[PDB]
Amino acid sequence: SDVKFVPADNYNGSPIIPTGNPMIDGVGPASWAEDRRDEPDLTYHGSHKIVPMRLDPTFSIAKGDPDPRGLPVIAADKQVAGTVVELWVNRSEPQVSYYEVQLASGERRVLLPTGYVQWPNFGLWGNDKLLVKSITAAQFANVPATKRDDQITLLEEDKICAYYAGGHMYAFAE
Amino acid sequence: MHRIWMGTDPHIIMSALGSFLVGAVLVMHIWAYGQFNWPATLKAKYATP
Amino acid sequence: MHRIWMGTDPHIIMSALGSFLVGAVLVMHIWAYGQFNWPATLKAKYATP
Amino acid sequence: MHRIWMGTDPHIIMSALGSFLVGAVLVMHIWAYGQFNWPATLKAKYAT
Amino acid sequence: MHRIWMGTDPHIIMSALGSFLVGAVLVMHIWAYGQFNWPATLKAKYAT
Amino acid sequence: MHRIWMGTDPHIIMSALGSFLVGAVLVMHIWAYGQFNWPATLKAKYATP
Amino acid sequence: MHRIWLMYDPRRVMVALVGFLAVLALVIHFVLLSSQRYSWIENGTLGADQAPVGASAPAA
Amino acid sequence: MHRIWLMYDPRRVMVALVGFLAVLALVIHFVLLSSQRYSWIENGTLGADQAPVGAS
Amino acid sequence: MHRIWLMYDPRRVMVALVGFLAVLALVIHFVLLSSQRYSWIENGTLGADQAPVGASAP
Amino acid sequence: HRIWLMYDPRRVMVALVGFLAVLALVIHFVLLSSQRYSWIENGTLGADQAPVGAS
Amino acid sequence: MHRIWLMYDPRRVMVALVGFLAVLALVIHFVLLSSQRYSWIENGTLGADQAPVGASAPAAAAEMSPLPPGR
Amino acid sequence: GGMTEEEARRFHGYMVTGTLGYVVVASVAHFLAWSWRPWF
Amino acid sequence: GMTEEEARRFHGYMVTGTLGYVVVASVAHFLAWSWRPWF
Amino acid sequence: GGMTEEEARRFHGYMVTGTLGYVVVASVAHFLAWSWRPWF
Amino acid sequence: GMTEEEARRFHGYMVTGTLGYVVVASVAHFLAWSWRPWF
Amino acid sequence: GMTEEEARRFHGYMVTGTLGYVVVASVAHFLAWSWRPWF
Amino acid sequence: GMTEEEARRFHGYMVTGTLGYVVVASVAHFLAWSWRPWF
Amino acid sequence: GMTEEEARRFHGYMVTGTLGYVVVASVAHFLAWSWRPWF
Amino acid sequence: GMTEEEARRFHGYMVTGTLGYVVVASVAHFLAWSWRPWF
Amino acid sequence: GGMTEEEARRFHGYMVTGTLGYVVVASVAHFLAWSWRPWF
Amino acid sequence: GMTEEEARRFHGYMVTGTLGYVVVASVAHFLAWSWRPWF
Amino acid sequence: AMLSFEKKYRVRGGTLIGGDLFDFWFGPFYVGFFGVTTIFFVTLGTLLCVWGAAMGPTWNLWQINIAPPDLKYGLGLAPLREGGLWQIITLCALGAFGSWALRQAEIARKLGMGMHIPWAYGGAILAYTTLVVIRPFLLGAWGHGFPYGIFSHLDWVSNVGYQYLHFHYNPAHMIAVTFFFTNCLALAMHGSLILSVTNPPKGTPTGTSEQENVFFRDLLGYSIGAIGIHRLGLFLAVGAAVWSAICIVISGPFWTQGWPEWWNWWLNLPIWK
C-alpha cells in the first residue's frame, strides 16, 4: 500500500486507522508537515541558525551548569539508548535545541530535541543521566536522520520532533 | 398463526408479555380501589372508634 | 413446559424469583398492616395508660 | 435440591445469610419493642 | 461442620469473632444500664 | 491450645495485651470514681471549711 | 425506511436520542414542579376541585 | 436484546449508569429534603395528617 | 458475579469506592449537623420528646 | 492480610496519617467553635452548667 | 519498628518533624493568646479564680436584638 | 452455560414442588386470616 | 469486544441486577407512601 | 470452579440442619412470647 | 490483568467486606434510632 | 489457608470455647434474673 | 519491592499500632464523656 | 430466532396460558359482580 | 459498516422500541389526566 | 518467622501464669471493694 | 539507601528524643495546670 | 469538512473515559464522552434559563434575571420559582464547564500536546466555583451567588462592592486589577511585535526573531525570549483570575468591615505607630 491510513468505517465523522507503523509513516500525533521547506533556518545575518556547538566556539555552557556531553540516555523502557556526544545550539536565541546521541546498540548518531529530555530531579540534583519518557530504546534506532551532520533543515526538524511527539500514543502499541 | 413467532426469541416475548400484565394488573387494581370503595370499607370495619 | 428453562442459569432464576417474592411479601404486609388495624390493636392492648 | 449449591462459594453464602439474619433480626426487634411496650415496662418497673 | 473452616485463616476468624463480641457486649451493657436503673441506684446509694 | 500463638511475635502480643489492659483499667477507674462517690468523699474529708 | 441506518451510524443516533429524551423529560418535570397547579411534591394530594387554577385580574 | 452489549461495551455502560443513577438519586433527595411536606430530617415524625400541604 | 473484577482493576475500584463513601458519610453528617433536630453537638443531650420538630400543617 | 501487596505501604502510611490529621483538626475546630464544647474559655464549667441547645 | 527508617529517609524526617512541631506549637500559643482566659501577657498574674470563664449562657432584654431586622 | 433439556426437566420438577408448597402455606395463612378478620 | 455468547451471559446478570434494584425501590416507595402519600 | 456436586450434597445437609435448628429455637421463642404477651 | 481464580477469591473478600460494613452500619442505625428516631 | 485436618482441631477448640462462653453467660443471666427479673 | 513476608510483618505492627491508637482514643472519649456528655 | 417448528410448540403453550388466564379472570369478575355490581 | 440486512434488523428493534416507549407514555398521561386534567 | 510450637508452648505457659496471677490480684481487689461499698 | 546498622541506632535516638520531649512537655503541662487549670 | 492537512490527525486514542465508543467527530467538533456530557449540560442548562425567562416579567435580553434564593433557605434547595431554578442551572453550569475542560484534555492528548490549555481554563472555573459554590458555602447560604442576567449580575457586583464601603481598598483586588491591566498591555505588546516583523512596510524583507528581540529589549530593558513571553502571558492572565478568586472569597467569609480600615495594620507598624 501507498496509503498511510484508511477510514474506520464509511460514516462521515469516523476516525482513520493507520495501515503501517504510525511512528514511521507519520500518522496521528506522529505526523509532520510533509510540505515543509527542506532548507535550513537562517539567522538575521544569513548563517545557519541551528548548528552543533563545536561549529561555533562563541557558545559555552554556563559555568554553574553541567555539560551533558558523555551522559547516558535512558529510554521509556528504562534501557540505555546511548550517550550524548554533542549539543546543537540556536544562534538567534541562544539555547540548546537538540542533544546528539551516539546509540549504544548500533553505530548511528541521532538528534534528540530538548523538552523531550528531562533530568532525574528536574536539574536540582543528581544530574548523572537523562530520561526520555516518550520512546523505547529500540525505537531510538529509527529516529529520522539529517542529510548532513552539521546542519538541519526545517523539514528535518519537523520529522524529528514529530517522531518523539508520537511516542506517548504509540511507543507501547502492538 | 404460529408463524408470527418465527424470527423472535421466546424470552423477550415472555418478558414483554410479563411486563405488560404486571402493568395492566396494577393499573386496574389501583383504579378499581378508587371506584369500588374497597379496601376503604375493610379499613372502616376494623378501625378504632 | 419445562423447556422454558433451557436458556437459563438456575441461580439467575432463583435470584429473580427470590427478589420478586421479597418485594411482593413486604408490599403486601405494609399494605395489610394499614388496612387490618393490626399491629395497632396489639400496641393498644399493651400500651401504658 | 442440593445441586443448587454447585458453583457457589460456601463463605459467600454464609456471609450473605449471616448478614440477612442480622438485618432482619434487628428490624424485627426494634419493631417488636415498639409494639409490645417492652423494655418500656421493664424500665418503668425499676425506675425511680 | 469443620470443613467450613477450610480456606479460612484462624487469625482472621478470631479477629472477626473478637471484634463482634467486644461490640455486642458493649452495646448490651449500655442498653442494659438504661433499662435496669443500674448503676444509677448504686450512684444514689453513696451520693452525698 | 498454645498453637494459637503459632507464627505470632510475642512483642506484638505483649504490646496488644498491654495497651488493652491500660485502656480497660483506666476506663473502669474513671467510671467507678463517678459511681462510688470516691475520691469525692476523700476530698470532703480533708477540705478546708 | 431502514436505509436511514446506512446514512447515520445507529450507535450514535441512539446516544443522541437517549440524551435528547433525558433532557426533555427533566425539562418538563422541572417546568411542572415550578408551576403552582402541578407543584405535585407540595400539593399532589389535593383533589382536582382544590387544585390551583390561574386567572387574570378582574378587569373592573 | 443482549446485542445492545455488542454495540455498547458493557464495562463502560455500568460506570455511566451508576454515575447517572447516583446523581439522579441525590437530586431527588435534595429536592424532597428542602420541601415543606418532605423535610424528613426536621419533620419526619409527623403523622400523615399533620404533614404540610402546599395549598394556595 | 466475580467476573466484574475481570472488567475492572480492583485496585482502582477500591480507591473510587472509599472516596465515594467518605464523601457520602461526610455529607450526611454535615446535613444532620446543619439541621435543628439533629444538631447533636449542641443539643444531643436532649431527650427524644425534647428535641426539635418542624412545623405541622396549620 | 495480603492487602499490602496491592497498595504500597510506604504510600498508604503517609495518606492515612494525613487523613487522620485532617479529620482530627476538623473535629477539634468544630468543637472549639461550638457553644457547649468551647473548652478553652468554658472548660472549667460543670456538665450541668455547660450550654445546651434549645428544646 | 526501626525498619520504618529503611522506608523513610531519616535525614528528611527530622526536617519534617521539627517543622510540624514548630507550626503546632505556634498555632496553640496564638490560639491561647487570642482567648480571654489565657491571654497571659495581659492577665497572667490573675489568680485561677479571677481568670475569665465563658458564660453558662448569654442573656438579653426581649426587645433587644444583636442583628438588624431583615427577611 | 444454560441448561440441557434433562437439567431443565428436573429443575422444573423442583420449581413445581416449591411453587405448590409455597401456595399451600399461603392458603393456610389466608384461612387463618379470614377466620381472624374477614375482609369481604 | 465480547462475543454474542458473552453478551447473553452478561445480560442475564444485568436483568437480575435491574430487577433487584427495581424491587428494592418498589418497597422503598410503598414504605414512603404508607408514611406520607404524595397523591 | 466453585463447589462440586459432592461438596453441594453434604453442604446441603448441613445447610438444612442449620435452618431446621434455627426454626426450632425460634419456635420456642414464639411459644414463650405467646405465653407472656399474646398478640391476637 | 486478573486471573479468574484471583478474581473469585477477591470477590469473596469484597462481598464479605461489603456486608460486614453494612452490618456495622445497621447497628449504628439501631443505636441512632433508639436515641432519637426520625419517623 | 487452613486445611481439613487443621480445621478439625480448630473446630474442636472453637466449639469448646463457644460452649464455655455460653455457660458463663447462662450463670450471668441466672444471677441477673434472681437480682432483677425482667418479665 | 514488597514481598508476602514483608506484608506479613508490616501487617503485624500496623494492627498493633491501630489497636494502640484506638485504645488511646477510647480513653480520651471516656474522659471527655465523664467531663461533658454529648448524649 | 425461532423456527416454524419452534413457533408451533411455543404457540400451543401461549394459547393455553392465555385461555387459562382468561378463565381465571372470568371467575374473578363473576365473583366481583356478585359482590358489587358495577352497572 | 452494516449491510441492508443488518440495517433492516436494527430498524425493527428501533421501531418497536419507539412504539413501546410511546405506549408507556400514553398510559402515564392517562394516569396524570385522571389525577389532575390540564384542560 | 514467628513462634514455633515449642516456643508457643513456653509462651502459652507463662501467659496462662500471668493471666491467673492478674485475676487473683483482681479477685482480692473486688473482695475488698465489696466489703467497703457493696454495689448491689 | 539506609542500612539495618544505621536504622537500629537511629531508632534509639528518635525514640529517646521523642520520649524526652514528651517528658519536658509533661512538666510544662504540670506547671500550666497548677497556674490556671482548663477543666 | 476538514482542513486540507487535517485528515492525517483524526486517529483513535487519547480518550479518558469512553474508549472508542464516542471517539468521533461531528463537523469540525470532536465529540468524545465529555462532548456528550457537555451537550447534555449545555442543553438542559440553556432550556432552564429560557424557562426562567418565560416565567419572568420580560423577554428583553438585557433584563432577563434568574435570581438565587433568599438567604433564609440556607444550603437547602429552595422552591424552583423562589430560586431553586437558579440552583439547578448552577449544577448544569458546573457540569458543562467541567466537561469542557476534560474534553479539551482528550483533544490535547490525541494531538500529542501538553495539558496547558485545560489547566489554564481551570483558572476560570476556579473563579466561577468561588463565586457560586465556595463563598456562598462559607457564608452559609446559596443565596449569596450572583444572579444569572446580563445586567442584573452587574447590580449584584455593584452591591457586593459597596457592602465593604470602598471595595477599591481590597488588597487582593488591587493585585487582581494589576494583573488584568498588565496582561492587556503585554497582549498589545506581543501581538504588535509578531505582526510588525511578519508585516513590515511595503517593499521590506520579512523580519526576524532577532529584530523583535532587539525591539522588545528597547521597550522593557531586558530580552524575554520567545517562550518567555508566552509564559508571561499565561502567568498574567491566569494569575488575574486566581487573585480575583482570592479577592472575593476574603470579602465576607474572612473580612467583614469596610476595606479602607483593613489598612490600619500598615499605619500601626511599630517603626511609626
Ligand SMILES: CCCCCCCCCCCCCC(=O)OC[C@H](COP(=O)(O)OCC(O)COP(=O)(O)OC[C@@H](COC(=O)CCCCCCCCCCCCC)OC(=O)CCCCCCCCCCCCC)OC(=O)CCCCCCCCCCCCC
Ligand atoms: C453573517 C452575516 C452577517 C455579517 C455581519 C454580522 C456578523 C459578523 C460576524 C460574521 C462571522 C462569521 C459567521 C459565520 O458564518 O461563520 C462560519 C464559521 C464556520 O466555519 P467556516 O470555516 O467559515 O465554514 C466551514 C463550514 O461551512 C463547513 O464545514 P462543516 O460542514 O463541517 O461545518 C458545520 C458548519 C455548519 O455551519 C453552521 O452551523 C454555522 C453556524 C454559525 C453560528 C453563528 C451563531 C452566531 C449567533 C449566536 C447567538 C448566541 C446563541 C446562544 O459549521 C459549524 O459547525 C459552526 C462552527 C462555528 C461554531 C460557532 C460557535 C459560536 C461562536 C460564538 C457565538 C457568539 C458569542 C457571543 O463559524 C465561525 O467561524 C463562527 C465563529 C467566528 C466568530 C467568533 C466571534 C467571537 C466574538 C466574541 C467577542 C464579542 C464581544 C462583544
Ligand code: BCL
Ligand atoms: C425465565 C424465562 C422467562 C419467563 C418465564 C415465565 C414462566 C415460565 C412463567 C412466567 C410467568 C409470569 N411472568 Mg415471565 N419470564 C421471564 C421474565 C419476566 C419478567 C421480567 C421483567 O424479567 C416479568 C415482569 C415477568 C412476568 C410474569 C408474570 C406475568 C407471571 C407470574 C410469575 C411472576 O413471578 O412474575 C413476575 C416475575 C418477575 C418480576 C421476574 C422473573 C422471575 C422468574 C424468572 C420467573 C418466575 C416463574 C415462576 C417460578 C413460575 C411458577 C409456576 C409453576 C412453574 C407452575 N416475566 C423470563 C424472561 N414467566 C408465569 C405465568 O404467567 O404462569 C401462568 C410462569 O409460569
Ligand code: BCL
Ligand atoms: C467463616 C465462614 C463464614 C461464616 C460461617 C459461620 C458459621 C460456621 C456459623 C456462623 C454463624 C453466624 N454468622 Mg456467619 N460466617 C461468615 C460471615 C458472616 C457475616 C458477614 C458480615 O460476612 C455475618 C453478619 C455473619 C453472621 C452470623 C450470625 C447469623 C451467626 C452467629 C452470630 C454472629 O454474628 O457472630 C459474629 C460473626 C461475624 C461478625 C462474622 C463471622 C465470624 C465467625 C466465622 C463467626 C463464628 C460464630 C461461632 C463461633 C461459630 C460456632 C460453631 C458451632 C459451635 C458449631 N457471618 C463467614 C464468611 N457463620 C453461626 C450460626 O449459624 O449460628 C446460628 C455459625 O455456626
Ligand SMILES: COC(C)(C)C/C=C/C(C)=C/C=C/C(C=O)=C/C=C/C(C)=C/C=C/C=C(C)/C=C/C=C(\C)CC/C=C(C)/C=C/C=C(\C)C(=O)O
Ligand atoms: C394490595 O394491592 C395489590 C398489590 C394491587 C394487590 C394485588 C396483588 C397481586 C396482583 C399479586 C400477584 C401475585 C402473584 C401473581 O402471579 C404471585 C406469584 C407467586 C409465585 C409465582 C410464587 C412462587 C413461588 C415459588 C417458590 C418459592 C419456589 C421455590 C423453589 C425451590 C425451593 C426449589 C429449589 C431447588 C431447585 C430450583 C433445584 C435446583 C436443581 C438443579 C439446578 C439441578 O438439579 O440441575
Ligand SMILES: COC(C)(C)C/C=C/C(C)=C/C=C/C(C=O)=C/C=C/C(C)=C/C=C/C=C(C)/C=C/C=C(\C)CC/C=C(C)/C=C/C=C(\C)C(=O)O
Ligand atoms: C425532581 O424530580 C425530577 C428529578 C425532576 C423528576 C424526574 C425524574 C426522571 C426523569 C427520572 C428518570 C429515571 C429513569 C429513566 O430512565 C431511571 C432509570 C433507571 C434505571 C435504568 C435503573 C437501572 C438499574 C440497574 C442496576 C442497578 C443494575 C445492576 C446490575 C448488577 C448488580 C449486575 C452486574 C453484572 C454482573 C455482576 C455480572 C458480570 C459478569 C460478567 C462480566 C461475565 O460473566 O462475563
Ligand SMILES: COC(C)(C)C/C=C/C(C)=C/C=C/C(C=O)=C/C=C/C(C)=C/C=C/C=C(C)/C=C/C=C(\C)CC/C=C(C)/C=C/C=C(\C)C(=O)O
Ligand atoms: C414486622 O413486619 C414485617 C417485616 C413485614 C414482618 C414480616 C416478615 C417476614 C416476611 C419475614 C420473613 C423471614 C424469613 C423467610 O421468609 C426468614 C428466613 C430465615 C432463614 C432461612 C434462616 C435460616 C438459618 C439457617 C442457619 C442458621 C444455618 C446455619 C448453618 C450452619 C451453622 C452450618 C454451617 C456449616 C456448613 C454449611 C457446612 C460447610 C461444608 C463444606 C464447606 C463442605 O462440606 O465442603
Ligand SMILES: COC(C)(C)C/C=C/C(C)=C/C=C/C(C=O)=C/C=C/C(C)=C/C=C/C=C(C)/C=C/C=C(\C)CC/C=C(C)/C=C/C=C(\C)C(=O)O
Ligand atoms: C437490645 O436489643 C437488641 C440488640 C436487638 C437485642 C438482641 C440481640 C441479639 C439478637 C444478639 C445476638 C447475639 C448472638 C447471636 O448469635 C451472639 C452469638 C455469640 C457467639 C457466637 C459467641 C461465641 C463465643 C465463643 C468464644 C468466646 C470462643 C473462644 C475460643 C477460644 C478462645 C479457643 C480458640 C482456639 C484456637 C483458635 C486454637 C486454634 C488451633 C489451630 C488452628 C491448630 O492447632 O491448627
Ligand SMILES: COC(C)(C)C/C=C/C(C)=C/C=C/C(C=O)=C/C=C/C(C)=C/C=C/C=C(C)/C=C/C=C(\C)CC/C=C(C)/C=C/C=C(\C)C(=O)O
Ligand atoms: C415546557 O413544555 C415544553 C417542553 C416547552 C413543551 C414542548 C415540547 C416539545 C417540543 C417536545 C417534543 C418531543 C418530541 C419531538 O419529536 C419527542 C420525540 C420522541 C421520540 C422520537 C422518542 C423515541 C424513543 C425511542 C426509543 C426509546 C427507542 C428504543 C429502542 C430500543 C430499546 C432498541 C435498541 C436496539 C436494539 C436492542 C437492537 C440491537 C441489535 C442489533 C444491533 C443487531 O441485531 O444487529
Ligand SMILES: COC(C)(C)C/C=C/C(C)=C/C=C/C(C=O)=C/C=C/C(C)=C/C=C/C=C(C)/C=C/C=C(\C)CC/C=C(C)/C=C/C=C(\C)C(=O)O
Ligand atoms: C462499666 O461499664 C462497662 C465498661 C460496659 C462494664 C463492662 C466491662 C467489661 C465487659 C469488661 C470485660 C473485661 C475483660 C474481658 O475479657 C477483661 C479481660 C482481661 C484479661 C484477658 C486479662 C489478662 C491479663 C494477663 C496478663 C497480665 C498476662 C501477663 C503475662 C506475663 C507477665 C508473661 C508474659 C510472657 C512471657 C514472660 C513469656 C515470654 C517467652 C518467650 C518470648 C519465649 O519463650 O520465647
Ligand SMILES: COC(C)(C)C/C=C/C(C)=C/C=C/C(C=O)=C/C=C/C(C)=C/C=C/C=C(C)/C=C/C=C(\C)CC/C=C(C)/C=C/C=C(\C)C(=O)O
Ligand atoms: C488549637 O488547638 C487545636 C490545634 C485545635 C487542638 C488540636 C491539636 C492536635 C490535633 C494535635 C496533635 C498533636 C500530635 C499528634 O500526634 C502531636 C505529635 C507529636 C510528636 C509525634 C512529637 C514527637 C517528637 C519527637 C522528637 C522531638 C524527637 C527528637 C529526636 C532527637 C532529638 C534525636 C536526634 C538525634 C540524631 C539526629 C542522631 C541520629 C543518628 C546519627 C546521626 C548516627 O547514628 O550516625
Ligand SMILES: CCCCCCCCCCCCO[C@@H]1O[C@H](CO)[C@@H](O[C@H]2O[C@H](CO)[C@@H](O)[C@H](O)[C@H]2O)[C@H](O)[C@H]1O
Ligand atoms: C435494616 C437494618 C436495620 C436498621 C435499623 C434501624 C431500623 C429503623 C426502625 C425500623 C423499625 C421502627 O419500629 C418502630 O419503632 C418505634 C420507635 O419509636 C416504635 O414507636 C413506638 O414505641 C416506642 C417504644 O415503646 C415509643 O417510644 C414511641 O413513642 C412509639 O411510637 C414503633 O412502635 C415501632 O414500630
Ligand SMILES: CCCCCCCCCCCCO[C@@H]1O[C@H](CO)[C@@H](O[C@H]2O[C@H](CO)[C@@H](O)[C@H](O)[C@H]2O)[C@H](O)[C@H]1O
Ligand atoms: C473480608 C475480611 C475483612 C472484613 C471482614 C468484615 C467482617 C466479616 C468477617 C467474616 C470472616 C472472614 O470471612 C472471609 O470470607 C471469605 C469469603 O467470604 C473467605 O474466603 C475467601 O478467601 C479464601 C482464601 O483465600 C478463598 O479460598 C475463598 O474462595 C474466598 O472467598 C475468607 O477466607 C474469610 O476470611
Ligand SMILES: CCCCCCCCCCCCO[C@@H]1O[C@H](CO)[C@@H](O[C@H]2O[C@H](CO)[C@@H](O)[C@H](O)[C@H]2O)[C@H](O)[C@H]1O
Ligand atoms: C428491544 C425492542 C423493544 C422491546 C420493548 C418491549 C415492548 C415491545 C414488544 C417487543 C416484542 C418483540 O418485538 C419484536 O422483537 C423482534 C425479535 O424478537 C424484532 O425483530 C427484529 O429482529 C429480527 C431478528 O432478531 C428480524 O428478523 C426482524 O426483521 C426484526 O424486526 C421485532 O422488530 C420486534 O417487533
